[PDB]
Amino acid sequence: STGGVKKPHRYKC
Amino acid sequence: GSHMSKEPRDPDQLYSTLKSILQQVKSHQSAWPFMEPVKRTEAPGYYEVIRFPMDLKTMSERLKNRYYVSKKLFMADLQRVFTNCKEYNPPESEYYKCANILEKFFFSKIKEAGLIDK
């Protein structure tokens, strides 16, 4: 239950 | 003429006061995206999007050094992890909400510790 990645977001492409 | 406030203020009372808040907000189920700083690239454009990427470890980093000579350092920075999480991340991702959420639990921890004041 521990995420490793940073769920690549898109706020400032 | 007052003495009911629990506001730490001092750099030591805060240091470890916050050492607990932090320890808590960080031990928070919504603190894993902040528990420690991202890979700088885990987060694509992280440092670009996040003018100031702060985490609970980074928080605790300061904490360790007793850097939090003010719950505001502590507030701002921990708030810097939530806000940066709220900044870049989408309220759909795991972290973003975890930011608001943590920021909320954390709020109960700072509040409790006479922190929040700004």
Is the Cβ of B38 closer than 8 Å to some Cβ of chain A?
Answer: yes
Q: What is the three-class DSSP state of B66?
A: coil
Helix, strand, or coil (residue A1): coil
Asked if A11's CB is within 8 angstroms of B89's CB, the reply is yes
**What domains sit in chain B, N to C, each tagged with a CATH number?**
1-118 (1.20.920.10)
Technique used: NMR
As a whole number of angstroms, the distance between CA B80 and CA B99 comes to 10
Which spans in B28-117 are helix H? Answer: 32-35, 46-49, 56-64, 71-87, 94-112
**What whole-number distance in Å separates Cα of residue B116 and Cα of residue B106?**
10
Q: Do A2 and B32 touch (CB under 8 A)?
A: yes
Half-sphere exposure of B18 (CA within 13 A, CB side): 34
**With a CB-CB cutoff of 8 Å, which residues 1-13 of chain A face chain B?**
2-13
CB-based contact B89 A7, cutoff 8 Å: yes
Determine the Cα–Cα distance for residues B114 and B8; give it in Å rounded to an integer. Answer: 6
Give exposure, A1-13, as e/b (b: 16+ Cβ within 10 Å): eeeeebbebeeee
Q: What is the chain B residue with the closest CA to A11?
A: B88
| Residue environment code for B10-37, b if the CB has 16+ CB neighbours within 10 A, otherwise e | eeeebbbbbbebbbbbbebebbbbbbeb
